Design a protein around this nucleic acid. Structure first.
Ligand SMILES: [Ca+2]
Lengths: 240, 517, 67, 484, 484, 92, 39, 40, 38
RNA sequence: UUUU
């Protein structure tokens, strides 16, 4: 059953001057009365989103401010979905002609619940097995990236011979500059849900391909880059 | 009453397992009536558009109230910024008596502008504004250079007993105007804007009264040319006085230069006391004595009085020869041998001294917005406006102002069209005193809404004004927009209401008391 | 009166509630809501007080509780 | 009998709705190009239905190869008078680097005689990227200053809507897209009018030529901002020239470092603060150097003591500009600062919610339908906002913007969504047939031909329109082609 | 509910509908000058009915010669704030050729201190052509920051009704006319504000001085844009110096070749890359040769080393522009690129189908009712499009445009259609009386007088307004005078 | 990574900068045998909520936090875990 | 005819008031005001 | 007659034709046209 | 089919709405959204 | 004990 609750702008007993008091009003809570509970759409919506962040929307279950984990933890909060859609393509060696009965690629994705960053691509044209060297050459790379934003354009990037990777960010959050002159961000944050559908954009017939996916947790244990004055030691890299 | 829900698939639409759209128009909780069924957003908006500040604490606010219910936009982001500023007298007018019965005047100009909230200028002495007094004021707001470095709400002297500050809107202002990281949205509308000017005064000396009145203003894009090799510029030296130090000894001029690139001015030869901007163009905040001299490496070539003055690698040195308790003479000096020194007469707290400069710098063209400064006159407003209200601050615990779709009968989408350097014109005001390059305020001006002012008068140095503002803007995000991720479907057209509103508004005076808040 | 405005507008919207929103009616409803025409006790004003007596009173009272 | 709109409304409604199904469904009837808002005494309504088959840049419209190679193609339809849309492309499957897109734009902001581009012919602005301009013929057809010289005071797009059929052989349908309407409005940044000497600039966009020595021979598009057009022609070296039609100077030419074309100054010119050449003096242009990514160009003036020009230009990158100053007089014309509808698949999907993406295979293409997205009511763009389309975008710095009357010269339909359709991973061997059913309503001031079918404005039919408007704010405006 | 509208909203109705008849039919009720769109919280509505007596350029007002000779006279009405309308006449009933046309135009855009023609009085502009301007008293009165200054933050014409009564003795009560409305929006082409120096142009029109030896004398009006008004007085010779009230520099003189006028330069001047005067030189302008057809002139100054200046100007047609630079400063002030409403009786038909035409004998003249044609609502037209409009038109070469703040400077109603009425077979012995019921409604920002008249904007009378522009729509904005 | 010399690491503050949801699982999805001519559209849906402070260009979009619905949350949790986080791109 | 337009309106406005304001009614009125006498 | 979008018009246009003509009502049809509904 | 997850998400959720929501009771649901007791 |  339906319901709509309204948290008064005041507290029981508060005598409030006109001018002042609370400046924000509370968006009305709409609850779906159930024989056992009555969540608000911002819940269900979420629920679903959190659960099937895409089919929940395609389906018609993404209700209200679903980008807010219903756990009465925050007094105030900012919610928001980001639905960037990049079409990771095979990289370029050259207009080096292409036969259908020929070439193909390997491409992998690593998705991290990182605030700004979306996911990291990586592909190998001639289709390669990640050799140890290949790996390191890669990793060493991601790491040694200087103005990481430089490639936030989600543009391919080589490193190993025939090996290219790229970075795709949350177009709107990436959009929020860090440590800039007068720029900075939010206080805390927390992914409320996040899914990705790597639609297989393939010719009806050259449908050749196989993929694997799995969730693996990873937590960042921080190491520091000490501050300094007269001179700050560092290093200059030069990849080829 | 009841809830509505539109399908991702339009009757018949046959989408694939991952096609369609990525959105799901948040449900419609439109309330019901014998003749209409406005959605809480439509409704909330109505009240918000009507009694913004009140309707909220009134409990009548709700749903997408920051969105306009005229089902125009297919998608739109929106919100409200409720910045609360505390305006209060600028001079720490030192008094010996236990009762410094001093009074001050102060007035605010509200511009339904995207990033801008309102403007304000006060007079430590309750003296009214003079023509030339007013003029300097004006020409100052046009000459403000790296205006962004003023949003801090900080007070600024431009006249003798006059100071003035500008207040942005926390976030929209928090959206830069550089090509690198932040650029506005494709356009917008001031969905509703109100401000309460709470009369925060000691319930002892609550003297004072204020007049409020809405005045519509439409901007005129009197655009600046796009230069290439060289560009015309204006060297500005607005002489002023050290809020504390001896006039007849020390001055406090602000020295900027229209198209010349911001370059750090460090005081080298003199006593000390500088504060340079961070804006894109070169400007400085500096106070000092005669002998003192600041310096900096000229970012680009500079001409002046015909003959070239500086070159990229040159070093300009600015000093002041004489400092009368009210007049100021200064000197500008180039490394570049063969160049001659620049000198000019100014008058602190008065008009600026201009210096038709030329900068060897490619110049992006950008329009300047010729906007008629709304009646700032103690009593002009009182005349050209019948729908103005006014009471003593004591009674009306302040002023409540509600802007409205003033210019257009309907809600257009003020977009980039009228965006640019605010440059206020007025009667009796001479533009010859207007600085060149892209300076002054810079913002997209909601050409639909009613601009409006409110002057307070006869209050106490002690009395301060808490300006609780409720700005409701809605617009369409494009790219890089740090907000696009908040846009949803645009409010549905419930003109039924809308019209009513429009009538009320029209029927009403956008001014009220901070007790009717 | 905190939100005397929205309250005012509130009432008018109220009328619009039943009243088939004909710009013609809307007009009347608007005209009405303000208090310009067709009004009844559906009206209210200055409930607060000028400190003069607000203050003076509580000054008069402090000890005058004999009654 | 609730209301009875005349055909011209219905037909209109349905069109400003499904400008394809309207016609297709014979639902389009009456003089439907007129918006039944009833705002005009008289008006000339019209519907241009261009069907352009946007084929891949480096492809043979003839013996298409069943390549199996890819290519990006983004369309940015603008509700402009005689401008349908712009086509972005990319043979090599590569993303849009800031470099790239910044190069793109500047190209469009510095297109000397944009008319010379009406052919919608492909143009390489970046190593693997091309662009082109498709126009609404009939209107464009009406020669700007014209011969019969028909001149339209004000107009207003009554309905854009165009479908981008996904012309692809089941063999290779590998494709996916996503559209979204983003409103745009032009801020008239005016180009001043000067007297004896008006400033301008000299642009030179270098690139390689198709089927030519990627280091031995390079093609550039040399032009001059306020300079009166003048004829050029190779004087000495490997042939390769294409003159302009416009009223300003520009030219496309191919050749090696030995190749030298020349032309005679139409008027005085200063350069680097120096009298470069006067009326007579015959100027020459050549390449000190030519590589695969750079080119040293250098213009020699016939003038005596006229120091010559030397300039480095990375072909495929921007346009290296040389500020200029011609002795010609100039009329002050308006450049139109215009935001550039999100050019990136993601940029679009995150900032615009009402977008709608699809796999080409399933969605037989794409079908966007604009709509009065700004003015809640059909105002009337006129002289109001007409000029040189000069765009910006986040990232793009105008530091590389032409000083002259450049770019796409038209009138942007104030109130009306401009949309974007990105097609990603399309088969080299596949094309996008673009049938647009664009229509407008305008007024005639002077002409000899148009003011004939000028009739009365549509009968003001609120409910109709009312609804129409509801459905718009209501919809996505982007649908499976299968829905046109 | 009766659909009861304020008796003043009704006034507005008929006024809008029939601005002239409404008054006569007493249907002019209440403050009919305010638009009942229930928009403005407050506003001032005014209506000026200024009457102008249009006589044939040469024909006297005193004595009426019953020549049985004719003359083509046309009027262009613009919904400009203070500008009532413009009128041009050919003393030979002649056609408006191109040059004539262009000259006409050319002039209007180079009208320096346009305020100098506030006086209805004519002004030759071509071999047999004259033109003049009709201001709306009360508004024109609004001195733009002078001694007496009031101001309006924005406005919108509430209607405009001009009726050109055919005042002609029934004797030669002959000729005909054609009226039609053409909506035109303006574009703000900007005139960059400058500092130390400001570019400009020295115009010098030339044409026979009615009542002086054709080949001998010649009346010419030469001006110099940025150059501050200078007081010119004949220095040596045959009299003939009419000065300007204007803010810039302009003067109309006439006389023998040897005649000389001179004034002191109020600021340094440059011409042909060279210097000409200091803020104190004694500039001397005179004529070299005077042909009933042509005319050579030349100006010089006391500036030591100041070269002389010389150019020619075929009398009667066009001006001799002189790229100049002045030692003073300019304001951002921009001109308004405005399409010129079909000046030929030709196009008018060939373009405006809801145009009318009757004989002046039956239709006692022509009465036109301007109406909101631009946008479907009564948007407010403020500052946004104010400036010295310079009309452009096919054929007209911008080249001929001055360079400073010239032309009729005023605001344009971003809504109301402009209209033109051409009278053709009129007899010189006839005069066209012009009743002009034009009423605008705006808002005040600063002033000492107007304010007190501002009240509340007319309540939203949706029902009326509705039908209002509904009728105006289906109706020819032109009508038989006698139908007012 | 298992078998990587932290010697190749760049000194200073380089690498991709950012805050990591110290809560969510990260994933990996490798694809092989994808014809060069075939590509992958990565339609994502990243939801997130934080608490704005100053200069935030979002504080406006801020307001009241979500109410506690662990009554439901619970399900979601024990639900996710119940299954993989990996599915067919035809079940979204 | 003493401002044909004027009367021509009085008629159109006359009908209006003394009849519902259907946004669609109006049309027929404005249309009757001159040409199609509405039924 | 393939237009879905079009059908989604004649459907509402269909209604409108015999609908009370209230713009409030119009909202109703305009949502019905999209084939919306009152959930529960 | 598209939204396969949100399917159970519903069965699950829905079921909950009626059941005596309890960690235990719940688990059982999350289990029914897929599993079978054998 | 109550006025505001
Ligand atoms: Ca407008």
């Amino acid at each position: 059953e339906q319901a709509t609750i309204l948290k008064p702008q005041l507290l029981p007993g508060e005598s409030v001057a006109p001018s002042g008091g609370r400046g924000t009003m509370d968006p009305p809570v709409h609850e779906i009365c159930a024989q056992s509970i009555d969540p608000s759409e911002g819940a269900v919506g979420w629920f679903y989103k959190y659960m099937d962040p895409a089919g929940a929307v395609e389906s018609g279950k993404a209700l209200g401010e679903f980008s807010k984990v219903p756990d009465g933890l925050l007094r105030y909060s900012v919610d928001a979905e980001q639905r960037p859609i990049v079409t990771i393509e095979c990289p370029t060696v050259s207009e080096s002609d292409l036969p259908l009965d020929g070439k193909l690629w390997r491409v992998s994705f690593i998705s991290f619940p990182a605030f700004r960053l979306n996911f990291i691509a990586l592909a190998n044209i001639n289709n390669e097995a990640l050799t140890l060297e290949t790996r390191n050459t890669f990793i060493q790379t991601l790491n040694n990236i200087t103005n990481w934003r430089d490639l936030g354009t989600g543009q391919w990037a080589q490193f190993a011979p025939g090996w290219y990777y790229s970075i795709y960010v949350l177009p709107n959050t990436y959009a929020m500059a860090e440590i800039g002159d007068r720029t900075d961000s939010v206080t805390q944050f927390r992914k409320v849900y996040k899914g990705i559908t790597f639609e297989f954009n393939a010719p009806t017939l050259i449908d050749q391909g196989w993929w694997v996916g799995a969730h693996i947790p990873v937590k960042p244990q921080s190491e520091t880059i000490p501050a300094a004055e007269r001179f700050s030691a560092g290093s200059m890299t030069v990849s080829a | 009453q009841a809830t509505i829900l539109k399908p991702q698939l339009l009757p018949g639409e046959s989408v694939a397992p991952s096609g369609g759209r990525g959105t799901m128009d948040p449900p419609v909780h439109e309330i019901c009536a014998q003749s209409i069924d406005p959605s809480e957003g439509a409704v909330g908006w109505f009240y918000k558009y009507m009694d913004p500040a009140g309707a909220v604490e009134s409990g009548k606010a709700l749903g997408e109230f920051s969105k306009v219910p005229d089902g125009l936009l297919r998608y739109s982001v929106d919100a409200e910024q409720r910045p609360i500023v505390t305006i209060e007298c600028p001079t720490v007018s030192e008094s010996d008596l236990p009762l410094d019965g001093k009074l001050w005047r102060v007035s605010f100009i509200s511009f339904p502008a995207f990033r801008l909230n309102f403007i304000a200028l006060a007079n430590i002495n309750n003296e009214a504004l003079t023509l030339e007094t007013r003029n300097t004021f004006i020409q100052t707001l046009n000459n403000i250079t790296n205006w962004r470095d003023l949003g801090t709400g900080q007070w600024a002297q431009f006249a003798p007993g006059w100071y003035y500050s500008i207040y942005v809107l926390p976030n929209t202002y928090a959206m830069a105007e550089i090509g690198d990281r932040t650029d506005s949205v494709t356009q917008f509308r001031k969905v509703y804007k109100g401000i309460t000017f709470e009369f925060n005064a000691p319930t002892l000396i609550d003297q004072g009264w204020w007049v409020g009145a809405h005045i519509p203003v439409k901007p005129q894009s009197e655009t600046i040319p796009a230069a290439e090799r060289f560009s015309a510029g204006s060297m500005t030296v607005s002489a002023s006085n050290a809020i504390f130090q001896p006039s007849n000894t020390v001055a406090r001029i602000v020295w900027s230069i229209t198209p010349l690139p911001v370059a750090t001015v460090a005081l080298t030869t003199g006593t000390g006391g500088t504060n340079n901007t961070s804006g894109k163009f070169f400007s400085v905040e500096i106070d000092g004595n005669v002998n003192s001299v600041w310096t900096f490496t000229a970012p680009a070539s500079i001409l002046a009085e015909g003959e070239p003055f500086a070159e990229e690698g040159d070093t300009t040195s600015f000093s002041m020869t004489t400092i009368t308790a009210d007049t100021v003479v200064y000197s500008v000096s180039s490394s570049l041998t063969g160049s001659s020194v620049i000198v000019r007469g100014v008058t602190k707290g008065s008009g600026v001294s201009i210096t038709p400069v030329t900068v060897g710098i490619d110049t992006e063209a950008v329009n300047r917005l010729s906007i008629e400064m709304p009646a700032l006159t103690t009593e002009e407003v009182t005349t050209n406006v019948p729908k103005y209200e006014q009471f003593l601050c004591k009674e009306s615990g302040g002023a409540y102002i509600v802007h409205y779709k003033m210019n257009n009968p309907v809600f257009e989408m003020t977009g980039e069209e009228n965006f640019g350097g605010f440059q206020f014109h007025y009667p009796g005001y001479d533009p010859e005193n207007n600085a060149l390059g892209l300076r002054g305020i810079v913002d997209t001006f909601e050409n639909n809404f009613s601009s409006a002012v409110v002057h307070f008068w006869g209050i106490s140095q002690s009395a301060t004004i808490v300006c609780k503002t409720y700005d409701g803007w809605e617009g369409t995000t494009n790219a890089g927009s740090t907000v696009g991720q908040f846009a949803h479907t645009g409010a549905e057209e419930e003109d039924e209401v809308v019209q009513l509103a429009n009538r009320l508004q029209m029927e009403l005076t956008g001014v009220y008391q901070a007790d009717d808040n | 009166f905190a939100g005397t405005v929205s309250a005012l507008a509130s009432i008018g919207l109220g009328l619009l509630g039943k009243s088939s929103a004909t710009p013609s009616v809307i007009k009347g409803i608007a005209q009405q809501a303000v208090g310009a025409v067709q009004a009844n006790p559906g009206i209210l004003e200055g409930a607060v007080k000028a400190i003069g007596s607000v203050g003076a009173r509580l000054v008069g009272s402090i000890k005058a509780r004999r009654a």
